[PDB]
Each structure stands twice: as C-alpha cells, then as structure tokens.
Design a binder for this molecule. Structure first.
Ligand SMILES: O=P(O)(O)O[C@@H]1[C@H](O)[C@H](O)[C@@H](OP(=O)(O)O)[C@H](OP(=O)(O)O)[C@H]1O
Ligand SMILES: O=P(O)(O)O[C@@H]1[C@H](O)[C@H](O)[C@@H](OP(=O)(O)O)[C@H](OP(=O)(O)O)[C@H]1O
Lengths: 127, 127
C-alpha cells in the first residue's frame, strides 16, 4: 500500500525506474526514482510502478527490462518470500526470468537470472 | 526545508514540472510532479526544483518556462508575499516577469505577466 524501495542484496542497490523507462540500480536512498509502488493483482502477483516515472516495470521477450507507461501482461511478477525478509520477483509472462541487478548496478538480463542468485533478492523498505 | 506544492489562485492549479522540462498546472494533488523543492539562495530569493523531474524551474529570455537539469541564473526568483498568504515568484534575470499559470492550466508567458494578476499568485502547501 505505502510506497517502497526494493534494496538488492547483490551490492545494495535500490532498484530505480527512470522517467524514460530505463531500469537500473543506485545506492543513493534519496534518489526520487527508487520510490516504487507495489500493487497486488492476484494472490502473490504484483506489478512494480516507479512513482516518479509513473511507469510499470516490464520484462521484455528478450529478457530486457523496460518500464511501460501502460500496464501489460509483461508487468506482472510472482512475489516469493525468502530468507530474512527478502523477496524475489519472477516474470508471469516469461516464467524462468527474474527482476535482478548486477553487482555494478546495471540490471541483469532475465535470461541470465535464476533461483539462489544474489542478483534476484530484493528487500522492500520504507520510503 | 520540506517539499511543497505551489497552489495557483488562478483556477486552482498546482504548478507541475515534467521530466522532459515542460511546465504546466494540474489540479490532481496526487500527481507526483507537483512535489517541488524551494531552496533559498539569497534572502527572499529561491530556486524551484521539481523533485521527481530533478530539474530547476527556469524563466527563459522570451518569457517561456522550462525546467533545467542544471541550475543557471535563470533559475532564481524573488519570493514575495502579497495578497492573503499567496506568494509571487519574480525572475531575477528578467525582472519584470513572473512565474504564472493561466486559468486553463497552461503556463502564462512571462512577457504577459504583471503585479496583481491572479495568474502570478501561488500558495505554498505541504507535500
Ligand atoms: O549494453 P548497453 O549499451 O548498456 O544497452 C543494453 C540495451 O540494449 C538497452 O539499450 C539499454 O536499455 P534497456 O535494456 O533497459 O532497455 C540497457 O542499458 P543498461 O542495462 O546498461 O542500463 C542495456 O541492457
Ligand atoms: O514501452 P513498452 O511498453 O515496454 O513497449 C516496447 C515493446 O514491449 C518491446 O518489447 C520493445 O520493442 P521491440 O520488441 O519491438 O524491439 C521495447 O523494449 P526495449 O526497447 O527496452 O527492448 C518496448 O519499448
């Protein structure tokens, strides 16, 4: 309900959604574009909206990330709860692929993600 | 200190700064792009920063308004209280021109502004 920041355990980057739809991670907590709004769709399914960008994170058919102005089926992810309050987000459309960030803060392509990676674990935090 | 919205008396529009630098007015409080940050430069001088856009309101030489990624001398305005709790913001660079919004929510060119207009009167409010 409240806004969130998703803190990636793989180097501690907050998942960031830019006004133009680019997706990446940054460490600066005061960054306005890491303020996200998670919305329940079905049980355990969420969309992830950049509040400032007013766009929905989308997993593309080639494993790229791009935030969409309009919701599509590419914008829904399974939220699975994991160890020490960390969540994973798996594309509903491309069911082997996760939202993920590299240790550099560049996001990790879905094709290269998988269970157990540090890259896919995000901790929701307050805003 | 805290973020603010500038509520314009000329039709009740909140001043909005878009990521691409466009400036306009909208009535929806929940619009993420009406969260502004006012920063004092000199006494009674301010810059006006769109928080989500991360850009500074600038008055241009032809009276256009456009939000700057970088601060320049066009980004400073004299903040003066007039009327009944409503402020005016007068360009330091183009000293006869004010920040202003039309009754439609399109912003009014600085060349067409002047003291006593409703278009130039803004009430700072909380965010
Ligand atoms: O390797 P590059 O030159 O950076 O370009 C890659 C991709 O083709 C996109 O152009 C870019 O945006 P999206 O993939 O998000 O659409 C993204 O940038 P980034 O991952 O470095 O942020 C990269 O995945
Ligand atoms: O903005 P949206 O709603 O996400 O829509 C576009 C579309 O979904 C495609 O997947 C892709 O272009 P093509 O597949 O036609 O090449 C592009 O992503 P990309 O540029 O980040 O790869 C997106 O802009």
């Amino acid at each position: 309900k409240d806004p969130k920041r998703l803190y990636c355990k793989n180097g501690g980057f907050f998942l960031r959604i830019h006004p133009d739809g680019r997706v990446d991670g940054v460490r600066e907590k005061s960054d306005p574009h890491i303020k996200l709004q998670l919305q329940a769709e079905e049980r355990g399914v969420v969309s992830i909206k950049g509040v400032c960008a007013n766009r929905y994170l989308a997993m593309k058919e080639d494993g790229r990330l791009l935030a969409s102005k309009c919701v599509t089926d590419e914008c829904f992810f399974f939220e699975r709860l994991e160890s020490n309050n960390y969540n994973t987000y798996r594309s509903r459309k491309y069911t082997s692929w996760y939202v993920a960030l590299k240790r550099t803060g560049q996001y990790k392509l879905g094709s290269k993600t998988g269970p157990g990676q540090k890259a896919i674990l995000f901790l929701p935090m307050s805003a």
